[PDB]
C-alpha cells in the first residue's frame, strides 16, 4: 500500500529536473518551429504558448504523473523537430477558428443550458 513502481523519477525534486530540461528544449525549439513551418506568429507568441502549457499542470505533486507528462511532452517535441507535424498540427494550440465562448454566468445563461 502506497509503495509503487516508479517510471523515471523517484521524487518530485528529481522529477522537476526533467520538467526544466524539457522546458529548455521547447524554449530553444520555438524559433526553429516558427521558421520551418512558416508560421505567421512571433517567437514570443510561441514561447508564451509553451509557458501556458507548462503552467497548466503546475499543481501536480505525483512524480509518476509528472514523468508521463514529460514523456508526452518529449513525444510532442520529437514530432515537431522532425516535421512529422504539419502547419495544421502546430496551430491547433492556438484555436484560431474557435469563437470565444462565454465565461460569466449571465453570458452562459443567454446562449444555452450548459453550466
Amino acid at each position: 500500500s502506497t509503495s509503487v513502481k516508479p517510471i523515471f523519477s523517484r521524487d518530485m525534486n528529481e522529477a522537476k529536473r526533467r520538467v526544466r530540461e524539457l522546458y529548455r528544449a521547447w524554449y530553444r525549439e520555438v524559433p526553429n518551429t516558427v521558421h520551418l513551418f512558416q508560421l505567421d506568429i512571433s517567437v514570443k507568441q510561441g514561447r508564451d504558448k509553451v509557458r501556458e502549457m507548462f503552467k497548466k499542470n503546475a499543481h501536480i505533486t505525483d512524480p509518476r504523473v509528472v514523468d508521463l507528462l514529460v514523456i508526452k511532452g518529449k513525444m510532442e517535441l520529437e514530432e515537431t523537430i522532425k516535421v512529422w507535424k504539419q502547419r495544421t498540427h502546430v496551430m491547433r494550440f492556438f484555436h484560431e477558428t474557435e469563437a470565444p465562448r462565454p465565461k460569466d454566468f449571465l453570458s452562459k445563461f443567454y446562449v444555452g443550458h450548459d453550466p
Binding site: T2, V4, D62
Partner: protein
C-alpha cells in the same frame, strides 16, 4: 520478494492531466453511480446486477435538414460497468469527476403462501382463481 526498488507516493491518485479530456468535460460534468432499475415491463433481474456510471444529460436539438437529433456532448452515450460501488467511486475520483452515488435498492423478502388464498376468516381469500 518484489526486488524492484519501489518508491512512496502519499497523494491521492489523479490522472485528469494525462487522460486528454478537455477541461470542459471534467469540472462541469456530474457522474451518476447507480444500479439500474429493473425494466418494469419484464420480470427478469439480470440487468440489475452491476453498477453503472452515466453522466448528466445535455441539450439535443433537431437537425435543420432532416430533423435528426443532434448533440454537442461527447459523453452522451458513455456508460461504464463496475462490479462494486467502491470500484465505481474509485474510477470517478481519479478522473476528477464529481459524482452522486445511489445505494442499491434490493427487493425486500416477501412471505408468499398459496394457502392464504383460501383463508377461513381473513381477507386474503380470493374471489376468483
Amino acid at each position: 520478494t518484489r526486488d524492484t526498488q519501489l518508491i512512496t507516493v502519499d497523494e491521492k491518485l489523479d490522472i485528469t492531466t494525462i487522460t486528454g479530456v478537455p477541461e470542459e468535460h471534467i469540472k462541469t460534468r456530474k457522474a451518476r453511480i447507480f444500479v439500474p432499475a429493473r425494466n418494469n415491463m419484464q420480470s427478469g433481474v439480470n440487468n440489475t446486477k452491476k453498477w453503472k456510471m452515466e453522466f448528466d444529460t445535455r441539450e439535443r436539438w433537431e437537425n435543420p435538414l432532416m430533423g435528426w437529433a443532434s448533440t454537442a456532448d461527447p459523453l452522451s452515450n458513455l456508460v461504464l460497468t463496475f462490479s462494486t460501488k467502491e470500484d465505481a467511486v474509485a474510477f470517478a475520483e481519479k478522473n476528477g469527476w464529481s459524482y452522486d452515488v445511489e445505494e442499491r435498492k434490493v427487493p425486500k423478502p416477501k412471505s408468499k403462501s398459496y394457502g392464504a388464498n383460501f383463508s377461513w376468516n381473513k381477507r386474503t381469500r380470493v374471489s376468483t382463481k
